[PDB]
With several copies, the nearest count.
Chain A
Amino acid sequence: LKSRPENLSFARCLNTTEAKFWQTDFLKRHTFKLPLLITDKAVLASKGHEMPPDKLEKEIMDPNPQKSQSCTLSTECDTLRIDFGIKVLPVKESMYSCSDYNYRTAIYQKIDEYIAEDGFLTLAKRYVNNIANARFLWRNRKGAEIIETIVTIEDKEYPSFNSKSFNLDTFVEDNATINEIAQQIADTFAGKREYLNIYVTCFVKIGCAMEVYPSQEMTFDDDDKGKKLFKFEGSAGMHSQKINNALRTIDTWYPDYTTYEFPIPVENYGAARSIGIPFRPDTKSFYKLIDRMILKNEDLPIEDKHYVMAILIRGGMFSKKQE
């Protein structure tokens, strides 16, 4: 093994589907639900942007028509309900394309070493922690009275959570339901199982006629000008990759971690848009780390193995420029 394969690629081992939005009442949340539609809106603002003084002297007092969309609850429902699901696939049976066979054998050997060493328990525990504390609500988490989350596997309905008590900076390892679910997730990841299906339903209490924040569509120059919200089967919803970004916010092993002291989403270069600082520029980058794991066959600390396996769960285009 002298270099990376020219067509190395990976799939994703955590398939997340689109979420759907429903509204109901907290005292009857197990009995009925109602659809939540997206409404159009048009506003008349003022020219409040920063302008050069010459234009500012001539159009400071001009109106400005704008278009937008908004999604709000009704006057008789105060609880927002979010339903989605996750499919878990084995890590070893997810390598999509690779040219060299020896590289595939080496990758399989290293994955087997990590399975025999750790057993995929830490990453599974962190993923179910990110599920538990309801990080996927994003802007809907602020100003909520009661947030509850339940997880259903096949027909076994686990007892409800309380994501308000879970801190967003530390990961617990002693919750009974969290460890029980993480056991199945780790078994599926290692290869003892072949597939896992998990369904998540979340109830958020915010008050009557409040505002919800679904995902916003991305528009280019040719498209119409204005804010567009994401519609899923008529009702509002969230993107799959928006939810997946919240689940994989488990990276606490980057350099200069003690200075900042918060997890970041697992990226290739460790970039975090929340604070706008790269965290794995050269030395702890995934490209440099996996070049020492395979080509040099040099053993790494367990933190680097954790980060590498977390990246390989996500997958991507790890190709080479035709050496």
Chain B
Amino acid sequence: QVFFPVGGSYHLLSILPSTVLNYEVSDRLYRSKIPKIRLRLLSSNAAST
């Protein structure tokens, strides 16, 4: 949760990720030549849970 200035006041913002966009980025970069980072650090049980 973060705070964003809206005019003269503040707004509370709750951030949610994007699973489908993450998967699409993963495959599109898999078939590409951009530098990229793999970032393999998630266990199988954590991914299941």
Contact = CB atoms under 8 A, between A and B. Distances in A.
Direct contact of A and B (CB under 8 A): yes
A220 interface: yes
Interface residues of A, number: 3
B40 interface: yes
Interface in A203-226: 220-222
Nearest to A97: B1
A282 B40 CA distance: 36
Nearest to A7: B1
B41 interface: yes
Interface of A: 220-222
Contacts of B40: 220-222
Chain A residues touching B, majority SS: loop
A221 B41 CA distance: 9
4 contacts: A220-B40, A220-B41, A221-B40, A222-B40
Contacts of A221: 40
Contacts, number: 4
Interface of B: 40-41
Contacts of A220: 40-41
Nearest to B42: A220
B16 to A, nearest CB: 17
Contacts of A222: 40
A4 B19 CA distance: 33
The 4 closest A-B pairs by CB, nearest first: A220-B41, A220-B40, A222-B40, A221-B40
A221 B38 CA distance: 10
Nearest to A221: B40
Contacts of B41: 220
A222 B39 CA distance: 11
A145 B31 CA distance: 58
A222 B41 CA distance: 11
B14 to A, nearest CB: 12
A221 B39 CA distance: 9
Nearest to B41: A220
B46 to A, nearest CB: 13
Nearest to A219: B41
A222 B40 CA distance: 9
A110 B40 CA distance: 45
A220 B40 CA distance: 6
A221 B37 CA distance: 12
A220 B41 CA distance: 6
A221 B40 CA distance: 7
B2 to A, nearest CB: 11
